[PDB]
Amino acid sequence: NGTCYPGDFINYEELREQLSSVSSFEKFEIFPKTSSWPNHETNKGVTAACPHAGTNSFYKNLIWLVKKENSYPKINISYTNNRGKEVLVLWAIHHPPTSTDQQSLYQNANSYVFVGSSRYSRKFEPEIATRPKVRGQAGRMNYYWTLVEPGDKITFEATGNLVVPRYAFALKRNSGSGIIISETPVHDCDTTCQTPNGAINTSLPF
C-alpha cells in the first residue's frame, strides 16, 4: 500500500537511503490546511483510486487543489526553514488524460508549475495523452521530494496541477539505523543486535 494513484516515483531508491540514517523526525504542517490557502478549492480532491471503506479519500500529507468556481489563481507561497534540522518535503504532479479535465479541475488552458530551492530547480509542462487505466484513472501522478537545508527557503509557483504539501518532516540523523526486509514479527523483547531472521544474544565474535 504505497502509491494508490498511478505514476512514477522519481528517485525513490535514493529517498530510501536517506531515511536509513534517520532515527526520528518532527512532523509539522508546513502549510496549514485552511490558513495557507484562502481562495482555492481544497476539500474537493478525493478519488476512487485511493479509497477508504467504500468512500473516496486521498493522501493524508499532500493536498489536491482544484478550481474554485472556474477560477484558479496563480500561487506564490514560500516557506523559510526556521527549524534547525533539514526538512523533508514531498509533492506530486498530475497529468490528466483529456485536455477537458485540465480546465474542469484547474480552469486554466495550458498550466505550468515551478518548484525552487538551492539544491533543486525545475519546471513541469503537464503531458496529456490516452494512457491505459490502472486504478480506474488514466491520468498519472508523478511524485517528487527534496531536502531543504537549514535556513534555505522553498518556493512553489503554479497555476494548477500542483499537489501541494500539508505536512513536512524535520529529520534527526543517527547512523547506526536502517531499513530491513523481514516477515518475522515484532515482540516486546529488547536486544542489542538484530537480524531480519531474529535477534542475537551472544558475546561470540562470529
Partner: peptide
C-alpha cells in the same frame, strides 16, 4: 551529488 548517496556509500 546529493542524489548519488547509494553509490557514494
Amino acid at each position: 551529488s546529493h542524489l548519488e548517496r547509494r553509490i557514494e556509500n
